[PDB]
Every structure is written in C-alpha cells, then in structure tokens.
Design a protein around this ligand. Structure first.
Ligand SMILES: [Fe+3]
Ligand SMILES: [Fe+3]
Ligand SMILES: [Fe+3]
Ligand SMILES: [Fe+3]
Ligand SMILES: [O-]
Ligand SMILES: [O-]
Lengths: 322, 83, 491, 491, 322, 83
C-alpha cells in the first residue's frame, strides 16, 4: 500500500521543506496535462485551438515551466497583508492632504496639466489591467499565472487611485472637466497616441510569450517611466506633493512586477534560442515604446530631457535581464 | 468479442458486458446475469431470461445469435425475466 | 476627509474607449467576448448590484484570512480529524479532491471575463472574482495539506484533477464546458449565474452547517469564510442576462441557462446528494437531499428566472421527479465501485438509516433497498467478493457519470442512446442527450472512460489495468467507510 | 528605507532630565518612587532585556486580538460551555471572578511605575505593561460575558472583587499589598518578578493546556494569548533587583522577594492547587499540583535568585514540605464551606481519584482521606446537613485564608498567634506571621472576616447574615460540582 | 434563586443593549468601594492617605463618576486597530520620504531650527506621557482612567516618532548633534524654559481634578498649538513636508484627547460649583501656559504672530467647553 | 459569650467556636466537638475530650471554667482525645 508523505507527492524529495508558497501555488494547471486536447471536450473547439496555438506552440520554450518561482513568493494571504498596509498609507495621504486643502493650493497651470497628463491614465492603467489578466489565462504554469494575477490586481489598484483623485479634482475644480473629458483626451490628444497605439496593438498579441514581452518587458517600463517617474517628479517640483508621493507608492508595485518578469526571463535563458526569441519580440515592440515616450514626454515641460531619461531607464530594465 | 451495454431488470445501473458474436441470446443473458444476479438482483428460478433491444424494444428469440441480431457495437440490451 | 464610495465609483468603470490602431473585433474577438452583435454602448448598461473597490477588498479579505487561518492554527494540535466520523472524513477528502484545483481554474474563467467582457463593470468585478478563486484554490490546498501524513488520500486534494479517475473526468467535463471553453458572456451566465448563484452559494452554507454539527470547526470556518466571497462575484450573470433579454437574445440566454442548470445538477447529484443522505450520521441530518434542493435551490431558480423574464427549463418536471432517485443511484454506483474512487464511501444502509430513507423517500426500500438487500446478505454470509465489481458501468457521454436509475419493484433504468456520424453515444437522461444535440461539435470526439477502454487505450485491458490508468493504488482505493460495521446489525 | 530598531531604540529611553522648577524629591516622591537613596544616574543603568517600540506593539497586539476574538466568535454557537464538565465550568467561573478586575487593577500598578520609576527604560516598559493589563482586564470580561444568560455565577466575573465574599477579600489582600500600595521599585520586584515571572507566566501555560485537554478551545486560546503578553512586562523586576544589589540594598531586595513569594504561594494554594488535583477530571491530569510546582516554579526561582545574587528565602524548606498539604486543606475548606463561594467546588474523592491522590501524595488517605471518609459516610447515610458548616473557620490575618493543615493520623494543624498592642492575631503559618512582624503598621488595623463578625459588623450575626454580608444568594452560592454523583460509588 | 440576566448586573435595566465598550470598561475600580479604607490593608498606610487626599477629597465632585462615557468609546481592541492604521501611514511616510532623500534636501538653516525646536520635544512628550499616566492611577472612575490610558500610549507614540526621526536626522547631519544635545537644549535654552517650568510644576499637582486640568485643559493645548500646529506649519513652508505631515497626524491624537476631556468637563458641569472649581484651576495655570507659548514661539520666525495664534487657539479649546 | 478558636484533634482546620464564660472545659469541648465530631472526625467513645492552650500547651482541668482559664478573647485551644 501507498504510505503517506510529508508533503504533496509532486514536491516529494524536494530536499528542503516546502514553503506555504510552494504548497499553494505549484503545478495547478491541468490543461497542460494533454497538449493535444487540453480541455475535457471535443478537441476541435475554438478554445482547444486557442491554447494549442498561443500557449503550447509559443516560441518561448522550457521543458518544465512549472519550476518557475516568484521571487517575492506572493500568496493571496500575503498579497492582501502587504497591500492593505500600502493602502493604509495611500488612504492616509488622501485623507490628510485633503484635510489641509492640498488641492486648493495647486496653480491653475498645474491643474490643467493634471487634466491632460494625469487623469486620463485611468484608460492606460485599465488597459494594463486587461493586458496582464490575459497573460494570466494563457501562461503555461500556475506560478507564472499567479504573478500575473497579483499584477492585474495592482493595475486595478492604480486605476482606482486615479478614479478617486479625478473625483476630488473635479470637486475642487468643477470647470476643468475632470471625469468627463478623459476619454476624448485619451482618444484624440497627440500626447497619448503613442501609448494608445502601443497598448491597443499589444492587447492583441495572443502568444503567451509575446504577450509577456509586449506587456511586461516593453510597455509597462515605458508607461511606468513616463507616467510615474517623469510625471511624478514634475508633480513634486510643481507643488503637487500628493501626486509625487502617490506615483512613488505605485512604483513599488511596478518594481515588484519587474522582479518576477526578470526571474522569468532568467529561467527562459536556461534554454538555447530563447534569448533570441525574446530579443526578436523586443525589437519588434521597442519602436512603439519609443514612440509612446516621445509623444507623451515631449509635451511635458523640459520634454526633451524627460524623453532621454525615460528611454534610458526603461531600456535599462531589459538590459539588466541580459 | 462484441461489446454491448447490459440493462438488467430490477438492477439500478447499465453495465458494459462483452459477449461473443457466436453467443446465443440465452448465452448473452447468462453473461449479463453474472454482473447482476446475486450481486444486487435476486434470482428468479421460475422465470427465463430474455434479451430485447433497449431502443425499440425488439424481443430476440432465445436461440438467435449475436451475429444475426444486427446490433450496433455497444448497443444497449434489456435482460428481462419472462415465462 | 474622504469621499463617499458612491461619489466616485462610476469613474472606476468608465474605461471603455473606441479602438483606432486595431479594430474592435480584433481587440474583443467574438469567440472570446461573446458580445453577440450587441454594441459596446449597450453592454455599458451593465450594472453590478454588489459593488466593491480595491481598498475595501484588501482590507476585508485580509481580515477573512486572518480569522480562518487563526482558527486552523488554534485547533490543529487537537487532532479532530483523527477522531472524526469516517463518513465526515470521506466527505472532506471527496470535497478537496474534486474542488481545490477547479476553484483555481475558476480564476482563469474570471480572467476570461476580466479581459474580454465589453461591459466595464463586468471586467472589474471579474478581476475581484479572479482574486477570490485564487484565494479559494490556495486555502483549499493549505488546509488539507495539514493531513498528508495521515493518509495518501489527502494528496488527492492536489492530485485528483491531474488523473483519469472517472470522478475527476466528470469534474473536468463539467467545469471545462461551463467556464473554461466559453466566451466571456457565456461564462457569466453558465458559471456565475447558473452554478455559483444557483447551487454552490447555498450548498456551502449547508456544508458549513454539517461541518459544525460534526464538530469540525476548522472546516466549518473554512467553508463559511469562502462562502461569503461567492456573492461578490456570483452576481455577474444577472446583468448579462438582462442585457441579452433587453436586446434580441432571450432564446440564446434561455438555452445557456437550461444547459448549465442541468449539468450543474448532475455533478451535484453525485458530489452532494450521496453525502447528505448517506455519509452524514443519521442523528446529524437536518433534512434530506431532496428537501434541501426544494427549499434552497429549486425555489430560488424559479424566483430568479421569473425576475429576469426567463422561463423554467423544458425539463423542470422531470428534474423534480429525479430528486427522488438520481442521487440514490450515484451513491449505490460509488459504493459498489468504491475501489475506483479516492475516498471511502459510507454505505449508510443500517436499519435506522433505512427507516429514515423510507420516511424521506416513500418506496425506497422496495426499490433501492432491494439492491442493498442482496449486498447485505452477501456480506452477512461472507461473500464480500460479490459486493465489488468485475466490469465497468455504462458512462453517460455528457455528464460522464454512470447511467443509473430506479431499480427493484419500480425498475425504470433507461439509456437515451444517439447515433451520430457512425458512432453510438449513451446518455443518462433526456436532457443530457439534448445538451449534446444542440451543439454536437462541442462534444463529438470526446471519449468517456468506457469509450477509451473499448478503443484499447487502457492497457492491460482489465480492471487492474483500468485502476492503474486512473492512478489508483492500494492505500487510496476506496472501501466501506465504517469498515462494514453496519453489517453486524444483520448478523 | 527604514532604520533597524537597535539604531534608535535608546533615544526612546533617553528621557531623564534635571528638574529646576521643582525638586527631584517633589517630582519623584519617595513613597511613590522608592529610589531608595540610589541616584538618577545609577537607575539609568536599568536595561530591559525584552525591548519593544510603539509601532511593533500595536501591530503585534492587533493580530493577537484578531485571532482570539475570531476563535471565540467561530465557536460561540457550538455551546461547549453547556456540555463541559462541571469541574471545568467551576474552574473558569473561579478564574474570572478572582482575576478579571485584578488584571485591570494591575494596569494601575504598571502606571505607578510608568510615572514614578527613575529608570527611563522602566517607565516605557511599564506604559506597555499598563496597556497589556488593560487588555487582560477587558478581554477577561468580554469572554465570560457570553455566558451571563446561563448562570448568575458568570456575573461574578465583574462582581466578585466588589464584594466581601471571603475569597475576594483574600484576593484584594494579596493584590493591594503587592502592587497597589507599594512604591514603583517595590512593585517591579513583588509583582513583576515574584508573581508574574515566578508564578502566573508558567501557570497560564498549564491552564491553557488543561483547557485544550478539556476541549475548551475558546478559553484555551484566550489564556494562551494573554500569556504571551506576560513576558514583555514581567521582565521589569530583574533589572531593578540588579540595581539594588549592585548598590547597598541586597537585604532590602531579599526581604521583598521573600514576602512576595510567600504571599503569592498562599493565593496559589487556594486558586490553583485545588483545581489541578480535584476539579480536573482524573483522566486529564498530566501531573499533580506538587509536581507542577517543583518542575515549573521552584526550580525556576532557585535559578533566578542565584543569577541575581540573592538567596533562597529562609522558609524554603517548609515551603517544600507544604507542597504536600496546603492545597489539600484549601480544597477541603472550600468544598466544606462551598456555599460561601460563587462557583461549585468538585469534591474529587471518588475511589479512582483517591488512589491517584495516594500515588501523588503517599499518606493522603490516612490523613486527608480520614475527613473525606466521614463526609462520604454522611452522604451515603443521608446526612448531608453534616457536610455543610455552622460556623466560620479561623482566618489568617495575613493571607485571609482559612488556617488549615494535615489532619487524621498525622494531625499537625497549628496557629502562629501573635499579640500586638492589645490585639490577638492569628496566622496560618510561620512566614505569614513573619510578613506581619517585619512591617506591622502596614497590616495593623485591618480586619479579616472573622474579626468583623466578632466586632459586630456582620448583622444579623449568624451564617445567613454572613452570607448576605458577602453578597451571596441562592443561585450563586456554591454546592458540589457533580451534584454528589461520586457518592454512588460508595452506595 | 437568582435568575441570570442578559447583561452585567450593574448595567441591568440600562434600557438599550450594552455595547462592547460599556461591557469591558465600566465600574471596574474597587478602591472607591470603601472611601475610608480604599485598599485591603491598614487604613493608615501612605497610599491609603494618598487616595483619600487626592482622589476622594478633590474639589471636582460628582455623585456618580462611573457614569462617564468616552465619546470615542475606545477599547483596547479598537485602539490598536485605529493606531495600527495610523502607524502604517506614518511608517509609510518615513520609509518613502527617506527613499526619495527628503532629509538631504532641507536647508542648513532649517536643519538647525530642527535641532533647537523639534528633537528636544522628546523630553516634553515623555513628560506628557508621565503626566497622563498619573491621571490614570488617581481618577475616580475606570471609564475616566481608560481615556488617560490610551492618551498615555499616544504620548509615548509621539515620543517614539521623535526618537526615530532624531536618529535619521543625526545620520544625515552627524555634525549637528542630533541625539546628543537635546537634554542641554531642554534644560537650558530660553525657548524651552516656559514649557519646562509649566510641565515640571504640573507634574506635582496630585489632586486628580487639578492634574486633569493642568495636563489636559491647560498644558496639552499649549504644547499642541506650539509644537504641532505652529512648528508644523512652519515646517511645511520651509520645505520639510515630512514634519508637516507628521505633526498633522499626531494632531489627530490630540483632537481625540480634547474630545474626552471636553466630555468630562461637560459631565462635571452638571453639578453646581464645579465650573468655578475648574475656572479657578485654569486661572492658576493659564499664566504659565502663556509664558510657555511666549518663550517658545517668540524664538520662531514671525514669532509674534505665532504667539497670538497659539494663545488664541489653545484658549478656544477651553472656551468651547464653557 | 466568649469566643475561642477550636483546633480539634485529627481535624484539618481551626474554627471559631463561641463558648460561655461559665462553661467548663468539658462543656467547652462539647461545643467544639459539635463542629468536628461526625463532620470530619470520627468519635472515640473510649477516650475523653480535654482542652489545652494551643500556644504553650497548658492542659486545663476538666472541671475548670472559662472565666478562670485566663484566656485572651479568640484564644486558640486544642481539643484532644485522652484517657
Ligand atoms: Fe470559489
Ligand atoms: Fe466562485
Ligand atoms: Fe495580565
Ligand atoms: Fe501581567
Ligand atoms: O467562489
Ligand atoms: O499579564
């Protein structure tokens, strides 16, 4: 008869005692059990074809994607403990900066810059949310999926901060159009068209490997450097201590996404040919990111400098991954 | 070997029962009874076990053989108690 | 100061825009979106009734886990699981093996809506729903993991869905059909409305009640806590259904509801029915599986369908009658073929239990009791070899469950066969065959356990071979829960 | 980034300054500070071993309550208290009535140190200690409050210390002497070192163990959680003792330790001893009260006193012998005078229990068993009127507990009387009389229950009158826990 | 026989169901049971005399002090939930403002102002801690004591924030003397002597009623307006966003202390003669508070204005209590 | 009425026992036995109950009365079994 183990049978002989993270996250997807018929139905259904083409047939390869491990080892339980603390901080900032009338002290010029450059990001942030939730459903391992899961929740977090602040700004400056105009700015303003073209096209890159690359490796670093880093620094220098601190807080989530993305690339580089596959996707998408950064930052004060810094910092993210 | 699904009278479930193409309905019923009689169905010494096509209810002669029954593989057959 | 939620909530869901660099159809592919010709503007009428924002979510969910994990740690060294009733133990092992990884898979079904739903409010609620199922999958691995050293059966909390054991195939058949291979809108309807709102939301309530009654406070708190997350995301189907009805798609909506409710019912008849009427100790039975279904499930569906402007499914009457039988057959099937499952089925046919069964189901002893009479005599007369099978039962090509029904004095076992393109399919009911006929290409070349056995895919081609094919070995293979203790009541 | 605690901790305790607008003696009055001629600079050497800062405190304590209150709410409707053993129920009612408000009073003893200690580190740790006892008092009201509808006895969790019921007088006698009427330094020594470090820290561990063993997870989690707060503030005495020894005050330090340990022991002999050897079901007894004291209390004190450069108190040998008897007398006293307490004392003298007692205490049946023999015969022969008293026992003027000792074949009951300024005082032991003689003005005109009865302060002057004076009425007045069930074993 | 009640017997017939707050906080002191011998020992012990003289014989009177109710209804459980959230905010500010090098951006002049005016408050804050912990042990009702209990914890909270920041400042400007010099500034600098004389004398007002008045009604409002309000506003205008936000956060605790202090005065005014007793103590102590505010604020930039504002705001606290 | 503390032989506790100043040691012992004999101490028909001052052990004559014993109020007395 079979004797009981001290851990899950798939983790047996793991050497060291399995952590809570490994216990709850590993080897959970079952659609990868039968590559020729992932789902328990007719093998010709559209979804069968979708996973075979965009998951199984991807040019990013490994023999054991399930070996991937999130460097932050995020679990649901710890994700909520972490973010509940971070939200207590952000909520406190909102509450107390409101108490001292922070918004009433902004210059008219800065308020107009916010209407153009800031509020409309609720569209870009939600697009990132959709972008990462797609990675969630097409990745080949549960440990990879979870990272995308929490990343998606973070994107919704930014969207939410943005929605909240848009309301406060509208209340303080009802004539600016905060809350009403964002869609028209996102759709029409030349400052946003680079980012809009980039994310719209990236949202239809179905291959899990290309989605990971287009979203995580190319688009997010460009959005983060432009909207959080550059706009955030500008905010501070313009007297908007709130946006300056908010952007820095959201950057913490972005740093975490870069950490797991970096670990996945590191694992992919264990196999010959993946470096080239990834660099090929980066060369395809990078030009749209440059375009996004250029159109957005050039419209900001001292744009030429902001552009160089954003281009430099975003590229550095990938350079340090090899 | 020919597979058929056995729906034994008074039983609660239909079962897979492999038979032979040269088997007689009586011999088919014998193979089916093996999986039902004395397992979850009481014997009926008086009665005689008969085989009928489940779909349309066609009653097959005790002596007819599987090969001439014009069954489809996996065909469901009712094994009933009769006089 | 802080704003009230109502003052800014809508901005969180004002996220649709008009694509320019890609087409709307490329961005929201029909096979994934299921917008069904209904415009983006019209889908924007979607309005979830139970609203929640990110900060409220992490705060509230943080406290839920603090509580559940605290209860677990405080009762862990008490070793309740070592002195719990065998029927209760088997109930949990069955629960975890069937559910754990399907809960996790549900996070992908939610993710399907989070990306592809054209309704903004649907995309955000699905993001929270995605997080909820992530929690459900993780916590339902974490809790049973505490018992891996007690029995290999607990390892199936992880393993089950990775095997070809018949029950697991039935589980994937249902879940993959309902939530993994359907467009966004179909998922909100079939999973969220039909299954979660209609079945599990109330069931988990009863399960948590039974756990408390059994003295298992750890499991009681677990299920109880998970249950509270359900409403938050189970709500998603309603609004979708109203949108489809408001426009010209009521029949399409009705057909999805009919299918989903039937498939949910069949899975339920095997995973819950047997447990309520046989595994739970007689003294701890508040009501019968049938009473539970009528009071808590059937009434609610009629209520819901009425308010949405939908009808009762065509099979409603048959469904009503089947409440007397179906689960009794699934229980007998599971117990007889016990060695084919990863938990120990409890016979539940002692004299006391049989009189209760007669009360709740007049005619039980004349029908179901007949089979159990033969089984008992054999056990009394030392012929246990006749209480285990030597062949495979006929499997339904839709629900992948055994085709079983009323035996004995009211014998009424039927097979709703269907020949389609040269192949003969078997169905355990009229509705099961119907599910196949309204969309044959979705099921066509799938093969159930029997089909595979007959095709030669199970080798060696015998029971011992079928057992290895299902990853079952001594130690996990099931047997009678109370080790035939109940037989002594008959000598 | 964030600093490490060690990098800035000291600044939190660099708070002493040289007063100018008032004198040092006015700011830190000797009767409240107890600096004892030792300078401010010298007290600044105080260095608590278990350090903690405000943010760490609220975070950690927040989680402790989340856990404890979560366990309580999850098990509340299970009604364990309604099916628990009577001895266990009585154990909790005794616990809550004696402790709850004394825990709260301890927050004032800590506050005494927070203001008046000259050692900065002592003032901050006492502020956290003040908060800990605030928690202990509140949570120990909150938990028993859940049972007020079950019996009026649960109301004594609040009431007890507000009455003149003898046990409560004994409690206040101890607590007011040790922590409420002493200077800051004396409190750190007598309360923090002698009582909390020496007795309760380990006792609560055993109490929580017994609770778990009894199946009371709510109470188990409660006591277990409270226990973890203890070390954090029980540490305060050590450093104070080292300061007194390093300077010229070792004898003063020794005398405080001697007194505090003896008084703590006497209270313990009545509140814990009886419970361990009589109320807890025989099958759930890990060790005897004596074994517990030796393994967990006595050894630790010797260890501690050695490391501090102090001696074993002069009464150590007698204390060792008394482990065989004292509690047996307190138990017999409490059971015989049962109607004078607010809980139901469990006799604990069934045949099985008496053989266990003989094992743990050779000679018990020849001594203690004798009294219980007469009691039993009377109960067997229908003379229950002879198992309740008709007079008051002699009370010790120090511990305010009955003067009792070895009966039967080794009769050794003694009274250490003392005539002081025209009054005759009675003491239950040599050390009790000693506590009075080293500081007569502290106790001089206090009167125990008997003194008051004899002075005419209890009217009407009879037992029924004494009962009303103690706020005791039918419903709360104690009786045999198992309702004399154990008598049947003797016919 | 006695039938069980639905609540504590002392709360029976309370009309409405008792709250958690009332259940755990009320009628807990037992030393008030016997005014002639509060403690269970000889009636002539020094502590017996202390409570009879400073608690029982106080000129602040009521027939039922136990009827007092904290308006915030603070319990231990809720106190920790509240402050854990507030500390997550303050800790986040510390952590993230440090990340962006906030301290390195302060002007040398402001850094010197911090060494004089800011760090040394660890002495004043601890003195407040000692001041409120004394009120705790001499108040006549447990509901009054608890308010002082949590107030004491808040004072330790401010001390702790101050100790932490002093270290950070010392690390960034090791030559200023942060951490070493505070005692000498507190003892000798004329700017602190008003406050030092005020708190030292107030710390020996033993009567519970006078302690409550000297500490809560007179001293705290003066310290709060000078060190939190005035210094805090100055900080903001000088570029120290951290101290500006920190002081505002600590002011929240101060507002809470004023709320319960206001409720106690309101209750005291139910009895004839107490208004006069309180106004008499305020007239005795107010002159030292004016002196404290004058010496401290006059040394700050635009001192004369700071003095008027602090005097005005602190007096308003008492004026609104009648 | 004169109060004394009774320390009855073989008992486990000293008790308050009010006696009369005109009582005889034998009558004192009788009043003390009431609270001990047949309650938690077995009778000894053969023996005779005697009273002695607990502090110094002075044995009092069976016929001596409380009033001449030169007791202090609340004095502790041992009641012992003797021949
Ligand atoms: Fe779920
Ligand atoms: Fe769900
Ligand atoms: Fe405590
Ligand atoms: Fe303590
Ligand atoms: O769920
Ligand atoms: O404690």
């Amino acid at each position: 008869a079979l004797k009981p183990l001290k851990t899950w049978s798939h983790l047996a002989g793991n050497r060291r005692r399995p952590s809570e993270y490994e216990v709850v996250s590993t080897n959970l997807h079952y659609f990868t059990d039968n590559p020729e018929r992932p789902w328990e139905l007719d093998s010709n259904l559209p979804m069968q074809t979708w996973y075979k083409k965009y998951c199984f047939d991807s040019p990013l390869k490994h023999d054991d994607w399930n070996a991937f491990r999130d460097p932050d080892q995020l679990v649901y339980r710890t994700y909520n403990l972490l973010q509940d603390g971070q939200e207590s901080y952000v909520q406190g900032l909102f509450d107390q900066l409101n108490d001292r009338g922070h918004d009433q002290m902004l210059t008219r010029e800065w308020v107009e810059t916010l209407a153009r450059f800031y509020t409309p990001a609720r569209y870009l942030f939600h697009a990132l949310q959709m972008g990462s939730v797609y990675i969630h459903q097409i990745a080949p391992a549960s440990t990879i999926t979870n990272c995308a899961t929490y990343e998606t929740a973070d994107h919704l977090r930014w969207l939410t901060h943005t929605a909240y602040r848009t309301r406060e700004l509208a209340n303080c400056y009802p004539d600016v159009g905060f809350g009403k105009r964002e869609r028209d700015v996102w759709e029409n303003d030349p400052a946003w068209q680079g980012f809009r073209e980039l994310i719209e096209k990236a949202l239809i890159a179905w291959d899990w490997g290309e989605a990971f690359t287009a979203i995580n490796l190319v688009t997010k670093p460009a959005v983060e450097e432009a909207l959080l880093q550059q706009l955030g620094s500008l905010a501070q220098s313009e007297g908007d201590t709130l946006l300056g601190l908010l952007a820095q807080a959201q950057k913490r989530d972005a740093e975490r996404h870069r950490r797991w993305s970096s670990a996945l690339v590191k694992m992919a580089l264990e196999k010959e040919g993946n470096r080239e596959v990834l660099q090929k996707w980066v060369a395809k998408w990078e030009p749209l990111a440059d375009k996004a950064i250029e159109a957005y930052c050039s419209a900001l004060p001292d744009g030429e400098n902001a552009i160089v810094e954003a281009k430099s910092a975003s590229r550095y993210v990938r350079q340090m991954m090899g | 070997t020919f597979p058929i699904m056995s729906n034994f009278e008074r039983d609660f479930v239909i079962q897979l029962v492999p038979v032979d193409t040269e088997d007689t309905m009586d011999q088919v019923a014998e193979k089916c009874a093996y999986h039902s009689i004395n397992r979850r169905v009481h014997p009926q010494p008086e009665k005689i076990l008969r085989v009928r096509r489940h779909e349309d209810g066609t009653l097959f002669p005790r002596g007819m053989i599987v090969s001439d029954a014009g069954l489809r593989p996996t065909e469901t057959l009712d094994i009933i108690f009769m006089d | 100061s802080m704003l009230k939620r109502e003052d800014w909530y809508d901005l969180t869901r004002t996220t649709n825009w008009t694509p320019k660099y890609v087409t709307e159809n490329e961005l929201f592919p029909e096979e994934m979106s299921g917008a069904r010709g209904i415009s983006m503007e019209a889908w924007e009428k979607y309005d979830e009734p139970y609203k929640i924002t990110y900060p409220e979510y992490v705060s509230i969910q943080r406290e839920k886990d603090s509580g559940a994990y605290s209860i677990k740690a405080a009762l862990e060294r008490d070793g309740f699981v070592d002195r719990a009733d065998p029927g209760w133990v088997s109930t949990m092992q069955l629960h975890f093996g069937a559910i754990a990884l399907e809960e996790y898979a549900a996070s992908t079904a939610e993710a399907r809506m989070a990306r592809f739903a054209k309704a903004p409010g649907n995309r955000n609620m699905a993001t929270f729903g995605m997080m909820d199922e992530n929690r459900h999958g993780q916590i339902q691995l974490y809790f049973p993991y505490a018992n891996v050293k007690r029995s290999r059966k607990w390892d199936w909390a992880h393993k089950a869905i990775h095997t070809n054991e018949w029950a697991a195939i039935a589980a994937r058949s249902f879940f993959d059909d309902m939530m993994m291979t359907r467009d966004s809108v179909a998922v909100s309807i079939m999973l969220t409305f039909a299954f979660e709102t209609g079945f599990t939301n109330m069931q988990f309530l009863g399960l948590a009640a039974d756990a408390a009654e059994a003295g298992d406070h750890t499991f009681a708190s677990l299920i109880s806590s998970i249950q509270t997350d359900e409403s938050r995301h189970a709500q998603q189907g309603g609004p979708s259904l109203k949108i489809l009805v408001e426009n010209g798609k009521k029949d399409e909506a009705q057909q999805m509801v009919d299918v989903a409710i039937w498939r949910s019912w069949k899975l339920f008849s095997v995973l819950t029915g047997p447990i309520m009427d046989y595994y739970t100790p007689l003294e701890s039975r508040n009501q019968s599986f049938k009473e539970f279904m009528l009071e808590w499930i059937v009434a609610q569906f009629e209520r819901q369908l009425l308010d949405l402007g939908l009808d009762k499914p065509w099979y409603w009457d048959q469904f009503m009658q089947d409440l007397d039988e179906t689960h009794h057959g699934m229980h007998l099937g599971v117990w007889y073929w016990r060695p084919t499952v990863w938990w120990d089925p409890a016979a539940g046919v002692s004299p006391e239990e049989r009189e209760w069964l007669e009360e709740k189901y007049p005619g039980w002893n004349d029908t179901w009791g007949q089979c159990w009479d033969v089984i008992t005599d054999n056990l009394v007369n030392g012929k246990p070899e006749l209480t285990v099978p030597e062949t495979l039962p006929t499997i339904c090509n839709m629900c992948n469950l055994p085709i079983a029904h009323t035996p004995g004095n009211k014998w009424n076992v039927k097979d709703y066969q269907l020949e389609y393109e040269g192949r003969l399919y078997h169905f355990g009911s009229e509705a099961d065959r119907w599910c196949f006929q309204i969309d044959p290409e979705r099921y066509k070349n799938h093969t159930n356990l029997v089909d595979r056995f007959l095709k030669g895919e199970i080798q060696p081609a015998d029971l011992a071979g079928a057992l290895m094919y299902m990853s079952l070995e001594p130690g996990v293979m099931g047997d009678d829960a109370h080790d035939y203790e109940w037989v002594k009541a008959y000598q």
